[PDB]
Structure 1
């Protein structure tokens, strides 16, 4: 079984803007997780072909990863901070759906999610 196409990161019909909240999401939130010791399983879509995980996309129907989130921010794909936060939440949820307590990746996700929450709770004020 093939990988699905990765999530879209551009759209010519979608309006675009820069905001302080989006700056914070890319340059503080994403950056903090991206450089973390545990980032590497989350830096790109799960390649179920190279990893030989044919059941991954049978279970995970809304895939998301930090490489996609990064590209979305860098391409100005998000208008609202809420959209970006939703994608981070989806990434973590998928990890907890597919993997079990005691799996190394679950403790990696929990550490990253704790840092995500600490950073998102300091999101700057809206315009």
Structure 2
């Protein structure tokens, strides 16, 4: 991947705010459906995603475009809404975190530019 202004913003602003939030703990690591006794989790959820995985990807310059990282955040929230019951508190926690995600994304740099200054 590469380092861009937008991906650096996603790492140092958006992820920093979401990771520390009081509602982040269910999303800081992949769902362990074996330990949770949930044999249907991976039958229903085709693309598991979590903030621990996203954070490691950002640390390792896995992404090529901010939009890919935004899709990973979105998949994580969508998985929660699809799998759980509409009245479960975790749905409310995801809605709270996703609202912060969108609020912070609103102030991301407009044009994606690689943060490299190279010598030919």
Residue 40 of structure 2 corresponds to residue 55 of structure 1 = yes
2-structure distance, mates of 1:19, 1:123: 11
Residue 56 of structure 2 corresponds to residue 71 of structure 1 = yes
Larger RCO, structure (CA 8 Å, separation 6 or more):
2
Residue 79 of structure 2 corresponds to residue 94 of structure 1 = yes
* Residue equivalent to 1:120: 105
Give the structure with higher Rg (CA): 2
Within the candidate set 26, 34, 40, 1:41 is matched to 26
Equivalent residues, number = 112
Structure 1 gaps, min length 5 = 1-15
Root mean square deviation, CA, Å:
0.8
Structure 2 gaps, min length 5 = 114-120
More helix by share: 2
1-structure distance, mates of 2:84, 2:36: 15
1-structure distance, mates of 2:57, 2:33: 22
Moved over 6 A (4+): none
- TM (normalized to structure 1)? 0.85
Residue 68 of structure 2 corresponds to residue 83 of structure 1 = yes
* Residue equivalent to 1:104: 89
